[PDB]
């Protein structure tokens, strides 16, 4: 298994480093350009902040877990379960954006009163706490417990499948993801109707931007859904051949992929970022 193992170990670290560089460049761009310091974007950081730590921590974790290394069960679950707290603080941010964009476009006139710096910061702080609670509840006691005090760590053996499908997927991922869908659908279809008869120019522009942040949400789902849908079959259908390891490894990575694309979309769609990305590459690296 010296060959097959290896393609994985690289494609992973390749992605791990993209995620550090792509999302540090986001977080830098915001620190720099005032025009970027707005509520909507503090959530796009909290998202970058997370997709960073996927590269620094989650992927290394995903690689040592890959092998089936030995550890005590509780000090083991943390490696298994730290990707989950990050996945969570992704969805909280992705949703916080979608609602910020609902308010801004459906109820423009009250956005000022309603959305502010201070509140955004608090929301972000709260979510990170929940994200930790939700991420590593298996550490809390909902867990499944070489060397006599140790345990061979394989995700599907220390993290329970019923926690993975009910409390992680149905509850904490599929729901926010759906009602994200509910929220964007109402913004775009409302606007389609509203544009046809009637600031006309301004609506188009703040919509266009939403379609951009919506496409982010789109891809998160595309990236995670395959893996979650497998966790469903693996559990709900035990009278089914368990998905094979090549398809397993695919969707493990496919997921890690999501931490890379976010910065490329900001660049390919959103001028204010593209311009701040350009200017950082021009002034700080090329000089």
């Amino acid at each position, epitope marked *: 298994p010296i060959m097959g193992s290896s393609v994985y170990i690289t494609v992973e670290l390749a992605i791990a480093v993209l995620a550090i560089l792509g999302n540090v460049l986001v977080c830098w761009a915001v620190w720099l350009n005032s*025009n970027l310091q707005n509520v909507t974007n503090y959530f796009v950081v909290s998202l970058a902040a997370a997709d960073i730590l996927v590269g620094v921590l989650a992927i290394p974790f995903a690689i040592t877990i890959s092998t089936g290394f030995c550890a005590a069960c509780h000090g083991c679950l943390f490696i298994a379960c730290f990707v989950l707290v990050l996945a969570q603080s992704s969805i909280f941010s992705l949703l916080a954006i979608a609602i910020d964009r609902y308010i801004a476009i459906r109820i423009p006139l009250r956005y000022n*009163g309603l959305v502010t710096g201070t509140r955004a910061a608090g929301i972000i702080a709260i979510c990170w706490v929940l994200s930790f609670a939700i991420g590593l509840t298996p550490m809390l006691g909902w867990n499944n417990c070489c060397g006599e005090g140790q345990v061979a760590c394989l995700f599907e053996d220390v993290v329970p499948m019923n926690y993975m499908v009910y409390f992680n997927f149905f509850a904490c991922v599929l729901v926010p993801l759906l009602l994200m869908l509910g929220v964007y659908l109402r913004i775009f279809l409302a606007a389609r109707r509203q544009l046809k008869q009637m600031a006309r120019s301004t609506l188009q*522009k703040e919509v266009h*931007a939403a379609k951009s942040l919506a496409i982010i949400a789109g891809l998160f789902a595309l990236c995670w859904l395959p893996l979650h849908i497998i966790n469903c079959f693996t559990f709900f259908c035990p009278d089914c051949s368990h998905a094979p390891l090549w398809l397993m490894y695919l969707a493990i990575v496919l997921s890690h992929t999501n931490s890379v694309v976010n910065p490329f979309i900001y660049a390919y769609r959103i001028r204010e970022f593209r*311009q701040t990305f350009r200017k950082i590459i021009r002034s700080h690296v090329l000089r």
Partner: antibody
Amino acid sequence: EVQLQQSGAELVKPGSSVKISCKTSGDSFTAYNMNWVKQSHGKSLEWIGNINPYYGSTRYNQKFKGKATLTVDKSSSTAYIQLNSLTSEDSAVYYCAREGNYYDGGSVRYFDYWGQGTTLTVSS
Amino acid sequence: DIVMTQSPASLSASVGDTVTITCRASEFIYSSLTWYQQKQGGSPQLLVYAATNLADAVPSRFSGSGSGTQFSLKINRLQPEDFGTYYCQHFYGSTWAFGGGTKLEIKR
């Protein structure tokens, strides 16, 4: 379309003060910042400051800190500016202008609607 | 505080010819710059916002361009109505300024 209707021309002694009106109408006054702009010598255009009419928080240009004072009466949808220790350097046209704002990734910002302006003439 | 530099201060031109006006920022303001038109005894009219965006009811013959420090407004096909003074203004950060302005005049 916000409709901005300012007060009429003033003529005041040096050392005196003066409070110009801007009555907004036919839109949310509290939804967007109300700015002031000084046109002096017929061409020169300075930014005086703005007020967030909801919170009544003010950002002033350094130049006009300790001259201009941005107040707001929310019930009537009226923004004020008071100018103190008036000297002949103060004699100019002052405009209220509404600051549009939306998100395309950044905070977009433009003075879209302007008052008819107001002539302050200071002489002893 | 960022200084804007507008040029030319004055410029004369016949109806139906093309013209351009320049605005330099003393610091990088990205695309945060607005153009306005003032006719004799009128208020500023918003002309272009966000460096490149035509305000509604501004004719299509008007258009702005640029990013960072150098921004120009081009008026394609001058009409009688287009004569007047033109100003640029930045909206970067917490404290803003205008240009000196540009009196467009009739050439004879």
